[PDB]
Design an enzyme around this catalytic site. Structure first.
Site, short mmCIF file in Angstrom:
data_model
loop_
_atom_site.label_atom_id
_atom_site.label_comp_id
_atom_site.label_asym_id
_atom_site.label_seq_id
_atom_site.Cartn_x
_atom_site.Cartn_y
_atom_site.Cartn_z
N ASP A 71 -58.26 6.43 17.07
CA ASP A 71 -58.32 5.61 18.30
C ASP A 71 -59.50 4.61 18.19
O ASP A 71 -59.32 3.45 18.63
CB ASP A 71 -58.45 6.48 19.57
CG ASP A 71 -57.14 6.92 20.20
OD1 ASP A 71 -56.07 6.73 19.57
OD2 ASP A 71 -57.18 7.45 21.35
N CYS A 115 -48.84 -3.66 14.57
CA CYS A 115 -49.74 -2.71 15.24
C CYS A 115 -49.67 -3.06 16.72
O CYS A 115 -48.52 -3.32 17.19
CB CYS A 115 -51.12 -2.73 14.58
SG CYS A 115 -51.83 -4.39 14.34
N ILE A 148 -52.58 -8.12 14.00
CA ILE A 148 -53.62 -8.84 13.22
C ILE A 148 -54.63 -7.93 12.57
O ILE A 148 -55.12 -8.31 11.46
CB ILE A 148 -54.31 -9.96 14.04
CG1 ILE A 148 -55.12 -9.42 15.23
CG2 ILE A 148 -53.30 -10.98 14.45
CD1 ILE A 148 -56.01 -10.45 15.98
N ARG A 166 -55.03 -3.76 11.95
CA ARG A 166 -54.37 -2.83 10.98
C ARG A 166 -53.28 -3.56 10.18
O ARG A 166 -53.18 -3.35 8.95
CB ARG A 166 -53.80 -1.60 11.70
CG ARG A 166 -54.84 -0.83 12.50
CD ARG A 166 -54.22 0.24 13.38
NE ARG A 166 -55.11 0.66 14.45
CZ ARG A 166 -54.80 1.56 15.39
NH1 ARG A 166 -53.59 2.09 15.43
NH2 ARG A 166 -55.72 1.92 16.30
N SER A 167 -52.47 -4.40 10.82
CA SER A 167 -51.40 -5.17 10.13
C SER A 167 -52.01 -6.06 9.02
O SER A 167 -51.42 -6.15 7.90
CB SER A 167 -50.63 -6.02 11.15
OG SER A 167 -49.83 -5.23 12.02
N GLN A 197 -59.87 -7.60 12.24
CA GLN A 197 -60.47 -7.83 13.60
C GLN A 197 -61.96 -7.44 13.66
O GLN A 197 -62.63 -7.84 14.65
CB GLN A 197 -59.72 -7.03 14.68
CG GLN A 197 -58.45 -7.68 15.14
CD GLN A 197 -57.72 -6.88 16.21
OE1 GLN A 197 -57.15 -5.81 15.97
NE2 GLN A 197 -57.72 -7.41 17.41
#
Ligand SMILES: Nc1nnc(-c2ccc(O)cc2)s1
Length: 281
Positions: free
Chosen positions: A181, A215, A219, A221-222, A262
């Site tokens: 998380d 995700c 932007i 995890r992707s 990110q």
């Protein structure tokens, strides 16, 4: 500069935040006028995450062709990816329309439907064999065929049917279920295992349309997934794998979708994944 040495040099100096800001400063800026039209406000999950006009995926319908999705085309690696947001309640039909129209074989999901006590994406696939989903706005039917649940990921076989022509296709759903998380994984081992399972399936191969990856915003995890894949493919096309500059690959990918990677922790994790995966490549 061998990235493993660049890595220790950044780590020992604690400059991850400084490298990451340099990327943000040099990253491309292109118009996203279609994404900001008032008719599209309920098609966007986040106000600050939009596809560029030049690289956006278009839906094949005269009504409204808009979806929050971009085509990332990596010319030297010879790989294409579609990066999209987690679908919204009113865009689940658009999502499966895109999968159909682009001839994708695989969908890669890097998030859970609920995280931090909030909904991050719609329940967009069926959870029981005998309870299929029908998308009336796009005339598609989706059935769960089988499900293989493992410790770090789940693989599902789905049947997508174009109700207009009665054609059917098999779609594979690769669901990475254990990203935490907060922060990033401690080891890249289970993320690399997952990536090689997607590759083994044929989903990333040129005989199909581009893989769809998402995700929540499409932007972070992707971004990590496609950056690691492209870097490992390149380390194999080059006489000198050491010539692979992960920062230059990321800026190339940011010509096609804004904001990929990110945080400074996601950048560091991307380095770790590529360094460790290269030991098997
Ligand atoms: N010391 C080394 N430099 N390159 C190697 C390599 C590259 C691509 C492969 O597919 C297999 C091995 S080992």
């Amino acid at each position: 500069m061998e990235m493993e040495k660049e890595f220790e040099q950044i780590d020992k100096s604690g400059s991850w935040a400084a490298i990451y800001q340099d990327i943000r400063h040099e990253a491309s800026d292109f118009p996203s006028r279609v994404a900001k039209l008032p008719k599209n406000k309920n098609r966007n999950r986040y106000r600050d995450v939009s596809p560029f006009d030049h690289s956006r995926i278009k839906l094949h319908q005269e009504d409204n062709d808009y979806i929050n999705a971009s085509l990332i085309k990596m010319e030297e690696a010879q790989r294409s990816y579609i990066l999209t947001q987690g679908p919204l309640p009113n865009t689940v039909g658009h999502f499966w329309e895109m999968v159909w129209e682009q001839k994708s074989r695989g969908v890669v999901m890097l998030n859970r439907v609920m995280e931090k006590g909030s909904l991050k994406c719609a329940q967009y696939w069926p959870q029981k064999e005998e309870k299929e989903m029908i998308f009336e706005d796009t005339n598609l039917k989706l059935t769960l065929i089988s499900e293989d649940i493992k410790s770090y990921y789940t693989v599902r076989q789905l049947e997508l049917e174009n109700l207009t022509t009665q054609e059917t296709r098999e779609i594979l759903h690769f669901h990475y279920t254990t990203w935490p998380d907060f922060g990033v994984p401690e080891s890249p081992a289970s993320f690399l295992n997952f990536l090689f399972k997607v590759r083994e399936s044929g989903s990333l191969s040129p005989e199909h349309g581009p893989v769809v990856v998402h995700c929540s915003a499409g932007i972070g995890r992707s971004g990590t997934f496609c950056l690691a894949d492209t870097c490992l493919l390149l380390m194999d096309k080059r006489k000198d794998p050491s010539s692979v500059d992960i920062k230059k690959v990321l800026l190339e990918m940011r010509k096609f979708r804004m904001g990929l990677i990110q945080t400074a922790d996601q950048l560091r994790f991307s380095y770790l994944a590529v360094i460790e995966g290269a030991k098997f490549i």
